[PDB]
Design a protein around this ligand. Structure first.
Ligand SMILES: *[C@@H]1O[C@H](CO)[C@@H](O)[C@H](O)[C@H]1NC(C)=O
Ligand SMILES: [Ca+2]
Ligand SMILES: [Ca+2]
Ligand SMILES: [Ca+2]
Ligand SMILES: [Ca+2]
Ligand SMILES: [Ca+2]
Lengths: 145, 145, 121
């Protein structure tokens, strides 16, 4: 876990508030093994709902000088709470199409040469990405570690 | 969910007690809000809420304390129709009982008339009964009485 | 009603209590923030509560400068209706009535989120 968000960071929830005042040492296996007041015993409201951001969480974006998110730019992968770039080797038309469909831009795309300016020169995360037919997200495409 | 005002000298004020089917019990200052007091005065036909007094203003109850928290929106006609959020026990003691003062504090009756509709107008103020004055006694007031 | 010349001894001079007070604190300059409005004593919700808000309260009460601004009802739970929510004091206003916030309205806040301050004695 990287973050532990509260106060409805990910939105208000609907339903009973089952647990409250959870106390865990971090070495437990299941959440119900933690010390809590009881099943449904709480004094809380729905605007204070717990959430987490885990280590194996990934997001994708295209960064240009003009805008952080756009339909053209540098391809960046957010892994382990950090951003990073993707290697150009073994790129294919199926792989470029998956990125464009995943972000919501279009059905196909093309790889242009490097632009005049690079921002922060973030380190490279992954390489040799190979996308099969059928996935609509980059997370299901085999790659190098 | 039947409300009741007990312990007050004037007609429409006292300690707030609510019957859960067949048992009367007190309410906490924290659990009771302005919206619930609006319904309580309206349900009991005591007008509008003037004050909410805590810390056992009209005495301390002797019995069970309800832990649930009313979530009235203010427009309900009875406390029964109000959504209620349950809470655990141990929240308060009996020195934190809530009290309410609603607006219709006037005490008037008709005496020395054989028919209950007709009689002499009397008013109670400062702990004593007395007779009104003829000046400014029109038929508009008599219609309301 | 009758109009007459009166000695200054017969005239009524009255001093009223303060609108804002702090409760449930060992130090007279520390405790839960309560305000009076519309016939009832009420509290403040901890949303958007910071040290700028605490400075105004500690100045209005006449205490010293503020140094901590607690939240989630450290000093105890309050009573009555919650009157203020999302207070945005700039730190220099003379009263909590000057700062913009949700005024005398329905607050989703509960009574476990009451705001508290601690001023220098
Ligand atoms: C998560 O924690 C990191 C590291 O402290 C911080 O930079 C980031 O803003 C946090 N994100 C959220 C959504 O709380
Ligand atoms: Ca914990
Ligand atoms: Ca709790
Ligand atoms: Ca009249
Ligand atoms: Ca809060
Ligand atoms: Ca603020």
């Amino acid at each position: 876990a990287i973050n532990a968000t509260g106060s409805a960071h990910f939105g208000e929830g609907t339903g009973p508030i089952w647990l409250d005042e959870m106390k865990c040492n971090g070495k437990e296996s299941r959440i119900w093994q933690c010390h809590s007041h009881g099943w449904g015993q709480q004094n809380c409201r729905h605007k204070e709902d717990a959430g987490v951001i885990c280590s194996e969480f990934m997001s994708l974006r295209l960064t240009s000088e003009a805008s952080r998110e756009a339909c053209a730019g540098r391809l960046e992968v957010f892994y382990n709470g950090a951003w990073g770039t993707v290697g150009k080797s073994s790129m294919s038309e199926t792989t470029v199409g998956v990125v464009c469909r995943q972000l919501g831009c279009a059905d196909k795309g093309k790889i242009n040469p490097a632009s005049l300016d690079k921002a922060m020169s973030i380190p490279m995360w992954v390489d040799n990405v190979q996308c099969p037919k059928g996935p609509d997200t980059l997370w299901q495409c085999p790659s190098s570690p | 969910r039947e409300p009741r005002l007990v312990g007050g000298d004037i007609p429409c004020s006292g300690r707030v007690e609510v019957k859960h089917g067949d048992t009367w019990g007190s309410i906490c200052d924290s659990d009771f809000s302005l919206e619930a007091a609006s319904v309580l005065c309206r349900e009991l036909q005591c007008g509008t809420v003037v004050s909410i007094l805590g810390g056992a203003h009209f005495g301390e109850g002797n019995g069970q304390i309800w832990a649930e928290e009313f979530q009235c929106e203010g427009h309900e006609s009875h406390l029964s129709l109000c959504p209620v959020a349950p809470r655990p026990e141990g929240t308060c003691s009996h020195s934190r009982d809530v009290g309410v003062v609603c607006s219709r504090y006037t005490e008037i009756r008709l005496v020395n008339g054989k028919t209950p509709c007709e009689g002499r107008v009397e008013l109670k103020t400062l702990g004593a009964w007395g007779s009104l004055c003829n000046s400014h006694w029109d038929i508009e007031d008599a219609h309301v009485l | 009603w009758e109009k007459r010349l009166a000695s200054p001894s017969e005239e009524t001079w009255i001093t009223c209590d303060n609108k804002i007070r702090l409760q449930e604190g060992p130090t007279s300059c520390s405790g839960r923030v309560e305000i009076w409005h519309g016939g009832s004593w009420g509290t403040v919700c901890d949303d958007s509560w910071d040290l700028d808000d605490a400075q105004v309260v500690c100045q209005q009460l006449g205490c010293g400068p503020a140094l901590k601004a607690f939240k989630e009802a450290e000093f105890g739970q309050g009573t009555g209706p919650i009157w203020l929510n999302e207070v945005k004091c700039k730190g220099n206003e003379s009263s909590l009535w000057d700062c913009p916030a949700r005024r005398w309205g329905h607050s989703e806040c509960g009574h476990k989120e009451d705001a508290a301050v601690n001023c220098t004695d």
